[PDB]
């Protein structure tokens, strides 16, 4: 499994902005959390998620602290209301990619099956294009051992909902 | 004079996906919202709970990790699925409503059927028991109503949904 | 910006205010909020502008009253029997919400500073 292309539920984007407003969430300041699904295949598909407490120094972006007893004790409940439904990655509202990602994403390498999925969704909505960038972390080798390079894949993705949120999404805007 | 029940948004897709992934089982889950004047009722969010074939220990676990993170709502009932047997309460539901009852008044039990509910149609009803004791000391029958639905979207969320196709 | 407060400013402990809110560009709800330093914004009251339907939150019932004028397109707050504890700057906020989760609500206006003296 090389990723090439990310589908996310209509849910998660509202799960997403959901935690962000009622967070209160000052400019400036991000909120953050795990994304669920299927990361097997060469499509990733997300669809679930779940807030994360997180604090980050905004004068230091060193310094920054995710609950692990946290993430572990959501997750035991989501197995077993889904097993289906793996740990994958993790979102945060952005908009932009921070410094502290690279890092923050390795601590996710630890819960999830294959390489992370970072999902950027923008709840302030002003791309006014799709509201969501996929990233994924990689790392080249150059000129034999005396440096490697690590950095952000940006995925394309995709808003695609099974027919239950199709449904739902219909009635609510109609 | 007719109260009602305010669904938001995530509690309708969380509803009808854990209602679809249990398919053909029941499934059930609690709801969060608040009470507001007699005839308004908001459910705000909802979580499913395991298939016990109503975890304690798990609601618990559950409610302190959600007011972590800004959910800070009160239980204000639950919901259950109905696969393709549209929507009622049994008698194991009417005890499970008055154990609810007995924490809040106005407690609510919604029931919906993931198998009926199609593009177009949810089948989905919310129900309160009805009140008996009226006539009971402190020291031909029907056991429920039905309450008034509808739904809730911020501005915010109706943007986003717009970006489905 | 759509939401206009006006009234309020300082006022002795046990004195009267009439808040008010005018709405420029018509939701169905309005509510006023308040936020005194180091405290999280606070629920007061909110009403239906169909109808008029009232809520208030327990520190403020009896005291406070939220009216709408539908022909004017404002909603007032008199605020009867102040004490220190209500001064903050009171906002106002439009959505289809009815109840007490500030998130839940549109918009709001930039607020109006009320002050009870101790």
């Known amino acids: 499994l090389q990723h090439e292309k990310v589908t996310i539920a209509p849910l998660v984007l509202l799960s997403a902005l959901d935690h962000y407003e009622r967070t209160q969430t000052k400019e400036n300041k991000r909120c953050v959390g795990v994304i669920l699904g299927d990361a097997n295949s060469s499509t990733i598909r997300v669809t679930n998620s779940f807030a994360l407490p997180f604090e980050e120094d905004e004068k230091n972006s060193d310094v920054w602290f995710l609950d692990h007893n946290y993430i572990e004790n959501m997750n035991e409940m989501c197995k077993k209301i889904n097993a289906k439904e793996k740990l994958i990655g993790w979102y945060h509202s952005g908009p932009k990619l921070r410094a502290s990602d690279l890092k923050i994403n390795e601590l996710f390498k630890k819960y999830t099956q294959n390489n992370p999925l970072l999902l950027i969704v923008d709840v302030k909505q002003q791309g006014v294009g799709l509201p969501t960038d996929a990233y994924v972390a990689i790392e080249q080798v150059k000129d034999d051992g005396t440096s490697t390079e690590k950095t952000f894949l940006h995925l394309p993705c995709t808003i695609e909902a099974e027919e239950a949120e199709e449904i739902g999404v219909e009635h609510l805007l109609r | 004079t007719k109260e009602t029940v305010y669904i938001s948004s995530i509690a309708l897709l969380k509803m009808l996906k854990h209602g679809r992934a249990g398919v053909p089982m029941e499934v059930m889950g609690l709801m969060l919202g608040e009470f507001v004047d007699d005839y308004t009722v908001n459910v705000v969010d909802v979580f499913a709970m395991p298939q016990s074939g109503v975890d304690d220990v798990f609601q618990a676990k559950m409610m302190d990790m959600l007011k972590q993170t800004g959910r800070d709502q009160m239980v204000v009932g639950w919901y259950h699925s109905h696969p393709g047997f549209g929507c009622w309460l049994s008698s194991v539901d009417v005890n499970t409503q008055k154990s609810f009852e007995q924490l809040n008044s106005r407690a609510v039990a919604v029931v919906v059927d993931p198998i009926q509910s199609v593009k177009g149609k949810v089948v989905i009803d919310a129900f309160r028991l009805i009140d008996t004791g009226a006539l009971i000391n402190n020291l031909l029958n029907r056991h429920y109503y039905s309450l008034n639905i509808d739904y809730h979207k911020t501005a915010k969320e109706t943007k986003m949904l717009m970006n489905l196709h | 910006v759509q939401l206009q407060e006006s009234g309020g400013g300082l006022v002795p402990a046990g004195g009267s205010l009439r808040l008010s809110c005018v709405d420029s560009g018509r939701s169905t709800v309005m509510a006023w909020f308040r936020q005194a330093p180091g405290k999280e914004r606070e629920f007061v009251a909110t009403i239906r502008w169909s109808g008029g339907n009232t809520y208030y939150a327990d520190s403020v019932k009896g005291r406070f009253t939220i009216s709408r004028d539908n022909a004017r397109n404002t909603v007032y707050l008199q605020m009867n029997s102040l004490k220190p504890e209500d001064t903050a700057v009171y906002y106002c906020?439009?959505?289809?919400?009815?109840?007490?989760?500030?998130?839940?609500?549109?918009?709001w206006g930039r607020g109006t500073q009320v002050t009870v003296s101790s």
């Open positions: 906020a439009g959505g289809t919400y009815y109840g007490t989760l500030s998130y839940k609500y549109d918009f």
